Amino acid sequence: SEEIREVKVLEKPWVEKYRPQRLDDIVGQEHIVKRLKHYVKTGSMPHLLFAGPPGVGKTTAALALARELFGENWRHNFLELNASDERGINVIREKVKEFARTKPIGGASFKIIFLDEADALTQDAQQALRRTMEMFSSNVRFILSCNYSSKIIEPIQSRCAIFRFRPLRDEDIAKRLRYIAENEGLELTEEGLQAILYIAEGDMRRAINILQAAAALDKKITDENVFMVASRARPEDIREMMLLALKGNFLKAREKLREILLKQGLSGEDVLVQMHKEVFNLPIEEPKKVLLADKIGEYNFRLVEGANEIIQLEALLAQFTLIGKK
Amino acid sequence: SEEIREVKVLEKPWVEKYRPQRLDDIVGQEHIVKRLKHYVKTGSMPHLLFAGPPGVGKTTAALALARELFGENWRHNFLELNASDERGINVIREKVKEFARTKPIGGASFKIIFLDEADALTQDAQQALRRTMEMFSSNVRFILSCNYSSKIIEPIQSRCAIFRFRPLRDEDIAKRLRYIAENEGLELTEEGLQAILYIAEGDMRRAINILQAAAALDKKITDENVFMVASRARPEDIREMMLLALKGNFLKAREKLREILLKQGLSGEDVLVQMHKEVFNLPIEEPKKVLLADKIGEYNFRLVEGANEIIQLEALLAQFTLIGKK
Amino acid sequence: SEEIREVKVLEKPWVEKYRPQRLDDIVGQEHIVKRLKHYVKTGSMPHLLFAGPPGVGKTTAALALARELFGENWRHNFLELNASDERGINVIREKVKEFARTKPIGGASFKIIFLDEADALTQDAQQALRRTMEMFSSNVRFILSCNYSSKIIEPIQSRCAIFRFRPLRDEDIAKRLRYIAENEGLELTEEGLQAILYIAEGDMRRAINILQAAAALDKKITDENVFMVASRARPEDIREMMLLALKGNFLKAREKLREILLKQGLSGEDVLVQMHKEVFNLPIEEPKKVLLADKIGEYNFRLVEGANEIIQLEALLAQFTLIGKK
Amino acid sequence: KVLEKPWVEKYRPQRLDDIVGQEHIVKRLKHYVKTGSMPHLLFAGPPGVGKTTAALALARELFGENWRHNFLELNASDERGINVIREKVKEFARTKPIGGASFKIIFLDEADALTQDAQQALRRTMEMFSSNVRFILSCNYSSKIIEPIQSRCAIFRFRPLRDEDIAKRLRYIAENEGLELTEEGLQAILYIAEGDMRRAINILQAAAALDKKITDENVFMVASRARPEDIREMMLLALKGNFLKAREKLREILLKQGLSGEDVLVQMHKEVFNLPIEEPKKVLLADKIGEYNFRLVEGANEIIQLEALLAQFTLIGKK
Amino acid sequence: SEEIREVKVLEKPWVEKYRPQRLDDIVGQEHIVKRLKHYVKTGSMPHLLFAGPPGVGKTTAALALARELFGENWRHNFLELNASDERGINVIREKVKEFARTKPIGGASFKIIFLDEADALTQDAQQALRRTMEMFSSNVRFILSCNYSSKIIEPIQSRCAIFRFRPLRDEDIAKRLRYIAENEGLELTEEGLQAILYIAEGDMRRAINILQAAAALDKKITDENVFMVASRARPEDIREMMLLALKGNFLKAREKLREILLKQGLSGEDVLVQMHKEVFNLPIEEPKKVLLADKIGEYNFRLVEGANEIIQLEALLAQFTLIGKK
Amino acid sequence: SEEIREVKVLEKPWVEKYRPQRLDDIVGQEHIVKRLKHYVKTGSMPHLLFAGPPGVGKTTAALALARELFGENWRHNFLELNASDERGINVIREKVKEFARTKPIGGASFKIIFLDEADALTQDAQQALRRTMEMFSSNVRFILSCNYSSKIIEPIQSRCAIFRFRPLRDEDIAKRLRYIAENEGLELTEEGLQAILYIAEGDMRRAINILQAAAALDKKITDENVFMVASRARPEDIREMMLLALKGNFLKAREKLREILLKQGLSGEDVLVQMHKEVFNLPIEEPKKVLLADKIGEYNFRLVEGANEIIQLEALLAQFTLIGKK
């Protein structure tokens, strides 16, 4: 009757389907929320600037806040625009003037325009936005999302309360993953759990995206699949490949590299990045880590210029055999 | 010579003549074929993301699926567009805009678009295709081909079923080469065969294009003609050249090189890639292989850095900055 | 009946709320102001050129000169373009053809175009400007802003009344700090005051913007809050990181970088910028200072060109460990 | 009209005095007409500077209205095989002249293109019908022609034309073909041709192929070279300390004109000395331009890189 | 009915018209002449290896030898071939087979095959020659010509009598020239002769070719014409360009270079060779000559790789300005 | 016919005229020659493995072995192949089996196949040789040549009698040179002999060539002719030149190079070869010797690629003084 289990899990993004709906559902940002609640509890708040990584809270809170601030009106008093991609037409001109001119729904004191990826706007775009901002201050309240506050011109920055979102701890990312798992028919094995936490590195959205894609292959989330979904390899394999080289077993490490490459089908950059991570979890004297670190930097730049992936990766492993002889 | 033979033996691409038209006519991608058959046998499939090398199954598996799904109605329900060659993102979100606006043919529930070289798209481009993908999510199903899944933005990957195509085994490649050989009337010499395998190293397409090419020169497939069209020197020659130089006969290694570059007029990268390969077929101590591998990586970069004019030009402008303030 | 404390402070930029609105309200640069009062009480004034540090008197003085020569419409006879934020000497020349186009509002002898950072234009550009300055000379007067009168060409300078502003002392702007800090109800801690001073680097505007942003974070203007909003790290922390590297403590330097990166949430460019500034306050010989300073620029080039941030940033630390040894 | 015939082959000098800028050469050429005696001639230099103009202009004065036969014009870059160069000549310099002088002229355009052996064959052919015909070999560098042919030739080195010379000629074509030669466009055509008269005539035309009005824009547009002002700005930005914006402008240029690393590179080379900076800076830039031209060159010399690598094997070879 | 002198001067190359006919006429190769005379005087002669520069006596000697060995029969019994495959190694070993499979004319005991540029053959080729050499050793006698004996394989070298030709002293060259000047009614000025000798550096052929070229321009041989037809600028001029660049006048040096290039019409390599010849004749400190010699070597190699000449030449001049700042 | 002394000397290469005929003719391997004679005495031998450097006795002895075992029939029973020559050894494998097929001529018990450079065979290649070593062990006997026995697989080593040839010594080489001098009517002087020994440095083949070449100029072998025919300058001269450069006397070095070049007419490479050798005989610290040597190698590469000989020689001498004063 219905579609296949595969399409059922791929249709709607788990990232959205399970985004917390209230400032009390959000996690790991405890201090950030306390500040936000104060707003909703007193119907008073200035323009906001949410700085930090993607998938750690920002837009979840930008929505939750509006929700607890307008109840059933959030959707009629909250304009979500994405500066960068610019979803649609001139999503920064005639669109706003409309929303901005009308009034809030309910006894609401103001509206909210959530400009996501604001730091993607040129200095000029930000100048215009500065005016377009102070223009309807009385009616609209801005919530600017960005990677780095230092990428937003000061005129705009001085009119905002700065919030700095940081990565989330594993436990928190884990609780959410365990929940989505149970409430989806998944058999989240612990190996698969750890495999997701490690890669995700504190980015909730990222962990979810890996969890979902994983489930599409099978309801039993195994680490082997966590790795097949992300262009990732087993952290254990990457280390062996390096140690083998360091120890002096260049040919063998070339062998290992060949396997990881064939099994995972990941890119040179993918391997390089994993290499840069595992190198620091190696029983190697400090001085060798210094040399290793420099080499990874240099080879990363060679890849950027277009150098041959396999040739460069093998030349890097040989460098390891060289740094290993000391 | 061959009067008209060199007109019929090469008028139609043997890759688009002997290309499997049935999922079960595909070799090497077993577990992938299994999954694909399950789609045609349910009428439901989500968006597809095909990751791996070229000429190894990705496009024949797209067509062999359109066939088993649209019967003779494939040429009108299955569209193929190259993400790179195509003018741009817009032209892309355009051609599909008119294709996915009219229902299928033959009662098929949906039509299919095949975006080849999808990772060739910029991030912004992948943002456009993303929206367009969701826009026509009911009428059309997308099959995105890419060299690495890690070069496709997460929003799109979290909506596709991931498939990883690996290189075909030499066995299967030969099985099909003999076939095409018989039905085409060719003296498939044991030599010329091994050549094509050694050069193709897993790439079905590449192996065929070469086979057909050598045939276009002479009905009898000689490893001589293989290397000729293959634009690759004889491994024996490459190894000799490198071995001579290693012995200490630079002057002689250099003549050998000149000859090669003279005969088949290969390229710097051609020779380099062949040298990278043969380093591991030489009778030398591992430590020497370590060095040679490092050196070949280095000259690969020298070649790359040389042909990357923008990187050079910008490094120049930066030199100006350190100068214009001295 | 009142907004929360956070909203009161932010509502208007303190840099304006404490801006000498009149010529006779400026303190510190007396000799200069008096000369400016000669043009207000005479009606006649030539093209001008202000020389001095940022936020030391340049803008506040020019703005005041538009209130005593236009009345309350200091906005309909006073343009404001930034030579460095503008394309070139065309988009700028065009803006002067649309401003001087229509005679000054009311009975106004002429309008005024405050070109900020004029000495940021190339000399071929400073020519076109000199050409444009005169052509409209009649209806519009200019107030070219620069950092050094010497960075302005001859054709220009000879036509301007050179006003030079002296860098306000460090404990000088401190006055206009403890003031506003007490006039706005703030427990401006001594540390924090010093922290603002270190980052302000002689610019009052930046110093005010930092207090306002810091005050919005809490009543007590602390150092932890001056950095968090400034998007910078404690100079001691930067230097300690660089020093820790030079000494060969690579591993420790890494963690310092991680901490800074994690907590303060800085950007690679942010870090690289602070590294380049704290490298000269190092208990190190000048020769190493220049080398290190160039390495920072080398790795930034890599970043500008697409290299991986954490990989390169750490590679840079290793260069430090390596350069320390030599 | 419109574009019936290339201004070049149309407004080409017919007399040795119609030629300008190669005075030392013309004076020597008019000594041949004056005595009716002349040896094999060797013309070396760039294209569009006077070589063929003189070849024709000379043959006209040595044969008069009757010179269309006493002048077999050939082009060395012919069908791979000089076996066609001995039969076509076997009968040309076998048929003595009449009406003209005591000999015939065979203008072999681009003679420095022949291979060693081909040139040695031309040395016997040259000597074969020496009494009948007289050769006029045209080349880029006389150093490409074998000495046995250089010693038998009177050598003339055609230099690039000066601006004043080229300019006026363009004018005497504009004011007779319905054209407006403004100042922005003139200084433009000149700047790009760098003394090449054929080029400055193909640029004047192509730029007028949009309208008689020759604008500095129509000029750079038709041609490849980018706006000197742009290249110059980019460098000043860079020099001024604004690497980011310069990088930006560069992309522009490339994105616009669609040029190569070397074209842009030569253009930079040219404007460096045309910059408001002190001399010492020009020293450092000059050095830096050379360095990067070398990097680009080295990067593309696949033989040198490969042999450098084999030389390295030799090193690694010694255990 | 005569011809203009310019015409009578260019009818036949003087290197030929005046090439010595007898061994006794040959100059500056005393000892060699004697060895060869002993062959004609005894009818006994082995294979020969003539090593040395071009235009100093090798060919003349080979010919003069034939003339004395075969009288008028020298053209019949003496065959010259350019090893530099004036058609291809074999299609040259073929021409020697036809020529060798026949009896000598006039009743002489053997014929001569004079190989020009033997040292231009690869080792494989030189190995084939050694065979052909041994094959007809009884009928033919080979005279192999090379720049350096060390470039000919030992097997061949052992079967030959080595003759090491040297450059000719100026006196020797002067005589010949003044002789030809006498016989051609030219005015060889002291200066013109000094120029010719300077430029020829001992190569008789070269000297005579310059004389001839210059005579074609005027019975009066002036150094102005010598330099002009020899495509070399005068020493004093090259020295000026260097001293100009060396004292700080880079812009001037460039100009001078421009003049030389345009005036005399040299090449990039021509200027470098001249600079190398003249740099040691400058009133400069030894440490500077050391840095300049190193630079000329570096730039020579850049030209060898095909770098742009003007760009490299100006860049080299800039190096003179830098080195110039003691 | 009665040719002059010279023609008689160059009649045939002395290396071949005096090639050791019998095992007692061989010089310098006394112990080995003893084992070899034992085989001829008993008419039987196992497979052999010759190890050591080139031109020191391996082939010579192998041939001398075949001559004594087979007498006049050696050429029929002794086959010599080169392992490294893959293509040829395969396009001749048929001939080999043929040699191994037919019985030994003259009634001898077996034929010998001499595999030169047997250590250029891979592990599998060596495994296969072993197969055919046993296969025909009854009719043919193998003599494998290599640089190191350690490069031949244990299996194959187990089946052979190992012989380790060592370098020859001046004394062995000098005795043979004396024998030839006597058997040719030469006046071998001490200076001449020591000169030869010095130039040949352990190479018997080269030593004989130098002697023959010198005998062709005179019957009295002087150290003057030896250096000349060998195209080498006085070793003291090369050393003095380099020492002069190193002390900082670049100009004197240059003068010396001039004198040398004036006295002989060597090539850039001739000089570099000698420099490369004499640098190791300078009273210099070893690390310097390695620098200088590397440097000569670098400049030889420019020369081989077409650089200007004299310009590079001078640039090289400069590099010496730059290195010295450091």
Ligand SMILES: Nc1ncnc2c1ncn2[C@@H]1O[C@H](COP(=O)(O)OP(=O)(O)O)[C@@H](O)[C@H]1O
């Ligand atoms: N504290 C959190 N609690 C629960 N889910 C979270 C939290 N932070 C992020 N997420 C998840 O990550 C996704 C990314 O949105 P968000 O956190 O606002 O970051 P961004 O600014 O990159 O959009 C959300 O859809 C949500 O599922």
Ligand SMILES: Nc1ncnc2c1ncn2[C@@H]1O[C@H](COP(=O)(O)OP(=O)(O)O)[C@@H](O)[C@H]1O
């Ligand atoms: N020693 C010499 N005596 C007389 N003429 C010489 C001598 N050396 C060179 N020449 C002249 O230089 C020309 C070059 O020929 P030659 O000396 O044989 O050198 P190559 O073998 O390089 O051609 C000859 O035509 C001859 O006129």
Ligand SMILES: Nc1ncnc2c1ncn2[C@@H]1O[C@H](COP(=O)(O)OP(=O)(O)O)[C@@H](O)[C@H]1O
């Ligand atoms: N003892 C010797 N007596 C005479 N000549 C020798 C002797 N040893 C080597 N040679 C010379 O060296 C050449 C090289 O052969 P050989 O010594 O067998 O070494 P390889 O194994 O490298 O071939 C011989 O042809 C011969 O000219």
